[PDB]
Amino acid sequence: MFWLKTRIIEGEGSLSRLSREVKGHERVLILASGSMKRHGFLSEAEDYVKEAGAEVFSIAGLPAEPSVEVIEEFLPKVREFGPDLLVAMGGGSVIDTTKALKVFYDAPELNFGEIAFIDRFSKPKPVPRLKTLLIAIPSTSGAGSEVSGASVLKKGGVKYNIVTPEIAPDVAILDPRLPRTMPPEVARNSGLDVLVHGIEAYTTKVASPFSDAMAIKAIKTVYRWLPLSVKGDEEARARVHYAATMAGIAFLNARLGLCHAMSHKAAWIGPHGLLNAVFLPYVMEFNASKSDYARRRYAEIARELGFQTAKDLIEVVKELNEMLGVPKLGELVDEETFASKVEEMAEKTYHDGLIAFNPVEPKPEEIKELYLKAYRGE
Amino acid sequence: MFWLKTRIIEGEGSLSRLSREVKGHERVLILASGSMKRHGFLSEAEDYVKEAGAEVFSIAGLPAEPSVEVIEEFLPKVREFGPDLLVAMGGGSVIDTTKALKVFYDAPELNFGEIAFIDRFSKPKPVPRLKTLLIAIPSTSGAGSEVSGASVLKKGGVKYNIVTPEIAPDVAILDPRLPRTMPPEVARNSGLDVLVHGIEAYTTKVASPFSDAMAIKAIKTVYRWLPLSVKGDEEARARVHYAATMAGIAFLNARLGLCHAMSHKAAWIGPHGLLNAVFLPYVMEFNASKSDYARRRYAEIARELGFQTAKDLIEVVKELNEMLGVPKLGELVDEETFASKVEEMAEKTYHDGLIAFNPVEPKPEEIKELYLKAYRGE
Ligand SMILES: NC(=O)c1ccc[n+]([C@@H]2O[C@H](COP(=O)([O-])OP(=O)(O)OC[C@H]3O[C@@H](n4cnc5c(N)ncnc54)[C@H](OP(=O)(O)O)[C@@H]3O)[C@@H](O)[C@H]2O)c1
Numbered sequence: 001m002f003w004l005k006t007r008i009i010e011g012e013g014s015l016s017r018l019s020r021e022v023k024g025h026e027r028v029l030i031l032a033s034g035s036m037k038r039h040g041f042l043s044e045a046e047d048y049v050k051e052a053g054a055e056v057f058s059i060a061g062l063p064a065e066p067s068v069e070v071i072e073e074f075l076p077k078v079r080e081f082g083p084d085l086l087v088a089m090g091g092g093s094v095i096d097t098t099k100a101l102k103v104f105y106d107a108p109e110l111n112f113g114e115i116a117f118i119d120r121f122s123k124p125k126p127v128p129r130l131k132t133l134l135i136a137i138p139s140t141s142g143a144g145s146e147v148s149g150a151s152v153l154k155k156g157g158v159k160y161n162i163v164t165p166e167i168a169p170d171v172a173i174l175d176p177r178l179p180r181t182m183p184p185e186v187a188r189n190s191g192l193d194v195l196v197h198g199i200e201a202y203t204t205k206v207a208s209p210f211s212d213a214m215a216i217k218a219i220k221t222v223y224r225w226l227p228l229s230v231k232g233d234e235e236a237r238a239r240v241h242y243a244a245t246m247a248g249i250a251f252l253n254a255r256l257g258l259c260h261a262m263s264h265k266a267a268w269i270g271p272h273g274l275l276n277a278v279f280l281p282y283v284m285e286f287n288a289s290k291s292d293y294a295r296r297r298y299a300e301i302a303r304e305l306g307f308q309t310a311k312d313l314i315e316v317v318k319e320l321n322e323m324l325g326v327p328k329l330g331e332l333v334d335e336e337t338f339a340s341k342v343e344e345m346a347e348k349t350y351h352d353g354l355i356a357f358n359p360v361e362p363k364p365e366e367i368k369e370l371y372l373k374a375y376r377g378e
Numbered sequence: 379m380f381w382l383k384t385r386i387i388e389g390e391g392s393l394s395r396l397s398r399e400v401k402g403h404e405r406v407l408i409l410a411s412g413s414m415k416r417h418g419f420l421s422e423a424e425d426y427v428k429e430a431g432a433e434v435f436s437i438a439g440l441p442a443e444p445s446v447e448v449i450e451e452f453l454p455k456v457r458e459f460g461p462d463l464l465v466a467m468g469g470g471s472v473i474d475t476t477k478a479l480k481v482f483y484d485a486p487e488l489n490f491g492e493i494a495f496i497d498r499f500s501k502p503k504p505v506p507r508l509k510t511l512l513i514a515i516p517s518t519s520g521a522g523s524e525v526s527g528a529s530v531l532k533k534g535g536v537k538y539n540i541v542t543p544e545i546a547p548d549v550a551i552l553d554p555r556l557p558r559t560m561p562p563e564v565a566r567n568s569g570l571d572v573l574v575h576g577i578e579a580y581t582t583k584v585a586s587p588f589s590d591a592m593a594i595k596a597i598k599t600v601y602r603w604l605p606l607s608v609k610g611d612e613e614a615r616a617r618v619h620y621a622a623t624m625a626g627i628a629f630l631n632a633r634l635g636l637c638h639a640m641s642h643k644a645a646w647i648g649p650h651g652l653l654n655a656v657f658l659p660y661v662m663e664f665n666a667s668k669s670d671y672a673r674r675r676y677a678e679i680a681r682e683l684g685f686q687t688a689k690d691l692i693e694v695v696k697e698l699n700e701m702l703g704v705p706k707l708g709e710l711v712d713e714e715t716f717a718s719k720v721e722e723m724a725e726k727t728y729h730d731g732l733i734a735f736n737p738v739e740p741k742p743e744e745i746k747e748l749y750l751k752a753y754r755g756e
């Protein structure tokens with residue numbers, strides 16, 4: 001199965017197409033990061049919204065790690081303003097925050113309790129039809145959240161999932177002026193996220209030729225361009241920006257697997273993209289040792305990069321990490337914390353729904369071992 | 379820009395998903411090629427419609443390469459039945475005829491002459507919002523009509539387009555059992571159309587990276603699998619079936635170019651896929667010599683197939699036509715008839731909206747030369 005709800009609008013200066021898209025709307029709410037404010041893209045968007053006749057109200061300064069707490073703060077100002085159009089302008093977390101906001105705005109009754117993918121052996125209640133349009137404008141490259149029907153959300157320190165077609169954005173605007181403001185480390189971290197997403201999407205149980213096309217292109221693009229992007233080349237920034245959305249389209253359809261699950265649960269340690277990169281080569285070694293299907297798919301990606309084998313790809317991924325100064329796991333977190341948490345982390349990873357999609361289902365013990373293998377820098 | 383209205387359902391035996399898809403509709407009309415009746419798929423589909431609780435009515439035997447008069451034949455039968463869901467099961471011809479029917483069913487005041495892209499120097503009247511749902515189920519591999527917003531009809535030996543997102547299908551079902559009953563020539567002809575779609579979509583002025591991904595995968599898949607499919611390999615049939623839709627998604631977004639325009643205006647000679655194959659190598663040479671952008675883009679494609687240059691790609695296409703027994707143009711039509719028609723085809727091709735998307739705009743006398751080159755088999 002393959003589909004795409006989101007309309008994509010790409011190109012230098014495509015932020016301006018925002019005027020077309022607000023036509024016929026009256027009250028526009030914009031959530032943005034501070035960096036979007038300080039670089040003047042928020043103003044620029046406010047102009048475009050005004051000159052299309054609509055009222056506009058902005059909130060900037062948003063944390064990462066969205067929560068039902070923080071969404072409480074907003075909802076009155078939100079609910080009083082009476083928006084009929086939401087705009088998210090920033091990273092994954094900003095987009096996910098706006099996505100989560102849409103649900104409580106549009107379905108104020110909805111018991112948060114009842115809708116969250118916390119366990120994979122739990123089956124939450126479905127989310128009704130919502131209504132407010134949602135435009136996503138990503139400033140990083142990136143999380144894939146501008147096309148996905150998923151947002152993550154804390155209700156007091158605990159992480160739940162919301163998953164439904166209803167919060168996949170209606171429109172995504174990809175203007176590479178925005179991601180050209182990423183500091184080098186952020187360009188690195190979020191670009192490795194693309195790579196991990198693509199490789200995982202290619203190797204799930206539910207991959208199709210349609211998602212494969214997108215995954216493969218994102219992979220080749222990151223492999224070829226990310227190092228130049230990190231050094232701040234402007235064209236390379238644009239290419240990786242588009243590839244980030246490609247990987248998004250892929251994992252929207254094919255989903256993800258063990259590596260993302262493992263990153264979710266070690267969130268406390270580090271940024272999402274960085275931990276993913278750290279784990280990937282171990283998850284690949286595991287998958288390839290245990291599944292012929294996984295081994296063949298990795299070889300297919302290797303050939304597409306101009307190599308031959310599954311082992312080529314694993315080694316090339318380790319060398320990419322080394323090249324871009326990705327730290328060992330031992331450098332991010334001391335032995336003592338890590339070791340006392342590894343079992344708890346394994347159990348949570350085991351209850352995550354994404355391991356349903358991984359080409360091999362790992363036992364709790366094998367997850368434990370993988371954490372330890374990664375830590376030893378094995 | 380990139381988008382996709384159509385929801386794709388793929389897989390062996392995926393026809394059975396018709397049941398889910400018609401649920402809560404009352405009157406379903408199926409328009410089908412003769413081959414779908416003879417080979418049993420039409421009964422199968424009817425059974426699925428029935429068990430979803432709908433009334434079903436089928437018309438089989440819809441003609442290949444339809445002209446405008448097909449509308450007056452079948453429209454009265456559609457009006458009499460009053461469907462609330464149209465299903466098209468057949469090649470691009472059947473799907474195009476169904477789309478056209480939808481237009482005149484939902485919007486009875488329109489006629490073909492108003493709304494078709496007859497002349498790129500006159501704006502046709504726009505098609506209003508339509509309403510009847512349309513499910514496309516292609517049985518060739520393929521025209522890509524199951525995801526495109528176009529319907530192609532002949533008037534006076536010459537093909538014109540109707541183009542609107544309103545006739546992009548809502549759902550496409552890709553079940554490779556269906557194209558397995560194609561005769562070899564039908565497999566060849568529809569398969570080479572996938573290749574031509576992909577190459578033209580890759581080299582228009584409005585190619586994006588998103589349409590590029592789909593275009594490139596379709597090309598690779600065809601290049602590798604079509605010879606085996608033509609011989610009757612069952613796997614290769616499935617692979618090329620999914621590629622045809624990939625190419626359709628590409629050209630839905632990137633459009634097409636001079637090779638399709640020329641084939642439209644020579645439609646009286648032969649079937650569409652065969653004409654496209656014959657012209658392509660000449661169009662490519664022309665574009666490559668006139669445009670550096672086209673040259674570099676053909677080379678990218680050559681590299682992806684494991685060659686190096688634009689020139690390699692042209693040679694590859696010529697060799698593949700040979701290997702598959704594509705006739706020379708001179709076998710299809712006598713010289714004195716062709717040569718008497720050629721100034722008119724060229725002038726009409728020049729007025730085709732598709733030449734605006736080609737990487738260079740030819741003059742009519744350059745088009746006339748192209749036609750004659752192809753005739754000589756240069
Ligand atoms: N809308 C668009 O975007 C678009 C783009 C490109 C081309 N086109 C159009 O599409 C048409 C060509 O479509 P096409 O290449 O799919 O061929 P087609 O013209 O629909 O069909 C060609 C022949 O194949 C036979 N057939 C089809 N499926 C079969 C199966 N499973 N088993 C056995 N026989 C089968 C049909 O025989 P029966 O009639 O006996 O069943 C028919 O005679 C042209 O009119 C062209 O203009 C449209």
Ligand SMILES: [Fe+3]
Nearest residue numbers: 521571575654
């Ligand atoms: Fe075609």
